[PDB]
């Protein structure tokens, strides 16, 4: 009774503190600057190959090769410049909800309803691809994986908890407990000192990698936060959700600075990502399209028409020259 | 340099060849999402996740969803390429059968599971008959509509089945098929079956059910029904 009353008072005091920080609004001060305007990204190529729906994808640091996981059980390593198969890896479990490329360009991660972020070695001296380390230490489905480096990898899951793993040892080093519902996505910072993670409780959380604790808890969503991605500078992040709106949260300001919303849109966001500039907030929606939002003024600059079924994932290159959008009709379309 | 671009391209032809070989076996195989409940005859028909079985030169791939935890709004989305959701329920467990009716209504009215047909297995049918003939826990208390519900005319019970049990048998269906008919679309149809653990021929019931679904899918494509 007393602990529950004190917990409710802490949440009210946290919102009241950040309300004082809200002197102006982001949309209010960014009205004067000129927008991106009419933007119409053509499809560069169409990566046809996957059998079933593509659930996830992620670029490499090289800004050429990209990996994508599909529900048939294949993890195809593409090459954007040449639209060809670098590698085609058969998974243990057919169902796979995430995949990620290592910053070095050596290892590749994947996982889903098996509850294992299976790491695969690309540069194998024998010949074929081989399972480097199976990271089985989660109660529920693996929802996202991101490599800090080749030595260690951060994970989210359907066990209500994120976790840092070290593949050399083969066990979880630091655990991240705090969310109420199952976590859906995560995004590493540029410095890789801390990371964010959106969950089905409708409240993102900034976790510190070294310490092993939540820095602050954000809340500016009505429904499940599906995706999450860091802003290029590393001081803010966007979050796609089932409430059919995206929300930018400043890490310094500690609140929702801006809401990207269109009342005509009635369906949730699956994936989100920024460009190198931090201008084009590219969010993938359930209605078979992806809206090119202006991160500055919160206005719909353009739209990505193409796919038959929903866009599940959306990644952007490190140099910021190309963008990819994996979809449930199994055709990865690259745009630039 | 000139060799390297073609070398990976000739290697990608083998990747395409392995992928196209993978597409042949995958497209032929049928996925099935067999979900149920705690103590509801889920393990009887199929605690393994995946179960491959060849019946009449048709490979299946029946996937249980037991290892993950009960919040099932974001992992159930992974099964819309699935051919048929085998929704198994305990007929005798009246208190928790209402949770299964709510679970059916969620699965049926979901956007991503809108295209999927549900092969319903009302499991523990002979064990339902034990509870109904006893008459300790009345159906009217947990479902007031039963007191003003008569038996269907098109109902076909097995020999030596009591009209008392027959009323209870076809009423459990009614609440499930009320939700099935409430769509008003015709993208997917519920296939109810009365089953027990001892009654072995359930994969045959799935085979005949899945036949009619993908028949309906082809007929519907050509605008013919």
């Amino acid at each position, epitope marked *: 009774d007393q602990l529950r009353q004190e917990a409710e008072q802490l949440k009210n005091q946290i919102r009241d503190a950040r309300k004082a920080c809200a002197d102006a609004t982001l949309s209010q001060i960014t009205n004067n600057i000129d927008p991106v305007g009419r933007i119409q990204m053509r499809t560069r190529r169409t990566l046809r190959g996957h059998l079933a729906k593509i659930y996830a994808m992620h670029w490499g640091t090289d800004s050429r090769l990209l990996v994508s996981a599909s529900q048939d059980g294949k993890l195809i390593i593409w090459d954007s410049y040449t639209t060809n198969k670098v590698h085609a890896i058969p998974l243990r479990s057919s169902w796979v909800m995430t995949c990620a490329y290592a910053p070095s360009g050596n290892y590749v991660a994947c996982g889903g309803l098996d509850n294992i972020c299976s790491i695969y070695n690309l540069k194998t001296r024998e010949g074929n691809v081989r399972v480097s380390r199976e990271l089985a230490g989660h109660t529920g489905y693996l929802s996202c994986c991101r490599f800090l480096d080749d030595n260690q990898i951060v994970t989210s899951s359907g066990d209500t908890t994120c976790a840092l793993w070290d593949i050399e040892t083969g066990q979880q080093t630091t655990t991240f407990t705090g969310h*109420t519902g199952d976590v859906m996505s995560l995004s590493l910072a540029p410095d890789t000192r801390l990371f964010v993670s959106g969950a089905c409780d409708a409240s993102a959380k900034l976790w510190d990698v070294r310490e092993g604790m939540c820095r602050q808890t954000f809340t500016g969503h*009505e429904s499940d936060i599906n995706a999450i991605c860091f802003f290029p500078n590393g001081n803010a992040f966007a979050t796609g959700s089932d409430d059919a709106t995206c929300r930018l949260f400043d890490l310094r300001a500690d609140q929702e600075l801006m809401t990207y919303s269109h009342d005509n849109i009635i369906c949730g966001i699956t994936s989100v990502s920024f460009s190198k500039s931090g201008r084009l907030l590219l969010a993938g929606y359930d209605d078979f399209n992806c809206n090119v939002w202006d991160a500055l003024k919160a206005d719909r600059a353009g739209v990505l028409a193409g796919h038959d079924n929903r866009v599940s994932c959306l990644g952007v290159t490190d140099d910021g020259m190309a963008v990819a959008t994996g979809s449930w009709d199994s055709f990865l379309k690259i745009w630039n | 340099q000139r060799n390297e671009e073609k070398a990976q391209r000739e290697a990608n032809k083998k990747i395409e060849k392995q992928l196209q070989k993978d597409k042949q076996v995958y497209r032929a195989t049928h996925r099935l999402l067999l979900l149920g409940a705690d103590n509801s005859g889920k393990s009887t028909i199929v605690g393994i996740f995946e179960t491959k079985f060849q019946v009449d030169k048709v490979n299946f791939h029946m996937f249980d969803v037991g290892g993950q935890r009960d919040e099932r709004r974001k992992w159930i989305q992974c099964f819309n390429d699935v051919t048929a959701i085998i929704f198994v329920v305990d007929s005798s467990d009246y208190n928790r059968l209402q*949770e299964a009716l709510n679970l059916f209504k969620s699965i049926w009215n*979901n956007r991503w599971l809108r295209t999927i047909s549900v092969i319903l297995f009302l499991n523990k049918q002979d064990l339902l008959a034990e509870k109904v003939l006893a008459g300790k826990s009345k159906i009217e208390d947990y*479902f007031p509509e039963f007191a003003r519900y008569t038996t269907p005319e098109d109902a076909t019970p097995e020999p030596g089945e009591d009209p008392r049990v027959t009323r209870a048998k076809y009423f459990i269906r009614d609440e499930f098929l009320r939700i099935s008919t409430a769509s008003g679309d015709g993208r997917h149809y519920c296939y109810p079956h009365f089953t027990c653990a001892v009654d072995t021929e359930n994969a045959r019931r799935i085979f005949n059910d899945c036949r009619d679904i993908i028949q309906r899918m082809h007929l519907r494509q050509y605008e013919l029904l």
Partner: nanobody, 128 residues
Framework: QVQLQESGGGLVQPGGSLRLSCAAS????????MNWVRQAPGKGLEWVSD????????SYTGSVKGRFTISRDNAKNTLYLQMNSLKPEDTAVYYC?????????????????????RGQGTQVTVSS
């Protein structure tokens, strides 16, 4: 912060009545399908009754069919449950619970504790 606050609830004699009222906040109340979930002494959670976004397609559990009555105020953002003729079996912690997605008719609530779109709950009790 997506909170639902259950007002009302308490002790009442068997055969009487008690009107629950759940104050909702932190989201657009009109866009979501609402429902009540009860937890009896030494038992798991179970669905009681739901209500649509417009407030038309209403459904109940058989134990509470005719006796209970659900309703909603979309303007002020709150849910109701006018319970009448309360039996000894009805004693439970009644949580008002919003469904996860908006613009829909599917709900995967009634979770094992972990479900954020649900209040702290009011202890409704029946004794004589």
């Amino acid at each position: 912060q997506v909170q639902l606050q259950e007002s009302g609830g308490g002790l009442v004699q068997p055969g009487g009545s008690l009107r629950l009222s759940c104050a909702a906040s932190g989201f657009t109340f009109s866009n979501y399908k609402m429902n009540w979930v009860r937890q009896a002494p030494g038992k798991g959670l179970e669905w009681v009754s739901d209500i649509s976004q417009s407030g038309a397609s209403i459904s109940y559990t058989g134990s509470v069919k005719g006796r209970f009555t659900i309703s909603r105020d979309n303007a002020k953002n709150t849910l109701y449950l006018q319970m009448n003729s309360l039996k000894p079996e009805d004693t439970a912690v009644y949580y008002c619970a919003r469904c996860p997605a908006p613009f829909t008719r599917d709900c995967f609530d009634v979770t094992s504790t972990t479900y954020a779109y649900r209040g702290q709950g009011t202890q409704v009790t029946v004794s004589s």
